[PDB]
Amino acid sequence: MIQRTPKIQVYSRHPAENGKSNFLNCYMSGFHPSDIEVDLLKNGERIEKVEHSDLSFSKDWSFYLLYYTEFTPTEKDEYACRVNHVTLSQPKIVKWDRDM
Amino acid sequence: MIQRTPKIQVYSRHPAENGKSNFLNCYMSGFHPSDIEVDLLKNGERIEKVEHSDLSFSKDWSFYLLYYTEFTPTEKDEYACRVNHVTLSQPKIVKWDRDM
Numbered sequence: 001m002i003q004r005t006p007k008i009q010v011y012s013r014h015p016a017e018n019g020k021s022n023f024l025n026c027y028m029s030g031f032h033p034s035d036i037e038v039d040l041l042k043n044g045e046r047i048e049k050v051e052h053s054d055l056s057f058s059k060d061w062s063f064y065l066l067y068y069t070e071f072t073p074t075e076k077d078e079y080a081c082r083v084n085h086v087t088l089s090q091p092k093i094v095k096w097d098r099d100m
Numbered sequence: 101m102i103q104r105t106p107k108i109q110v111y112s113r114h115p116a117e118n119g120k121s122n123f124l125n126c127y128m129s130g131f132h133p134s135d136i137e138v139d140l141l142k143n144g145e146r147i148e149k150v151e152h153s154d155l156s157f158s159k160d161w162s163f164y165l166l167y168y169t170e171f172t173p174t175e176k177d178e179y180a181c182r183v184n185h186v187t188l189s190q191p192k193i194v195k196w197d198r199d200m
């Protein structure tokens with residue numbers, strides 16, 4: 001059996017075909033087992049509509065999960081993504097660093 | 101003006117909803133200007149059908165490009181992706197490392 005904590009990255013992207021729209025991304029990579037929970041947070045509150053969840057694996061024991069949704073951040077809203085996994089005794093909250 | 105060479109990563113992923121299919125990915129990140137050329141290679145030859153090309157930007161001067169397509173690699177085929185950019189005097193060829 002192998003267990004590996006997700007590496008977590010939080011970043012925004014504008015699709016080039018629709019540069020006005022903006023997407024908050026939480027990327028979890030290299031984790032096992034594949035059981036996971038993830039929420040995007042806006043000022044500590046769960047964002048209930050998350051349009052996109054893309055799960056994949058490379059080796060049979062390495063999962064990758066992209067969880068993202070359109071947002072419109074203001075300079076005073078705090079965004080983050082909260083991840084639970086068996087390798088994490090407490091939920092892990094990673095803040096969006098605007099730059100990256 | 102800012103110019104930045106792409107960081108290039110080549111990796112495979114299986115979508116979890118269709119675990120049998122396999123995708124070769126070439127990910128170029130953080131580059132500027134956005135003008136770029138990229139091919140996936142199989143034993144040195146360009147792969148002409150590349151189903152997916154996802155371009156985005158974060159800051160106005162930082163582009164991200166995911167270029168990928170379904171493949172069926174054998175243990176003796178060599179895969180790579182070849183990138184041209186103004187910051188690269190010669191085309192850059194990054195080989196697929198199966199593991200990653």
Ligand SMILES: [Ca+2]
């Ligand atoms: Ca990615």
Ligand SMILES: [Mg+2]
Binds near residue numbers: 085086087090
């Ligand atoms: Mg836990």
Ligand SMILES: [Mg+2]
Binds near residue numbers: 184185186187190191
């Ligand atoms: Mg060049």
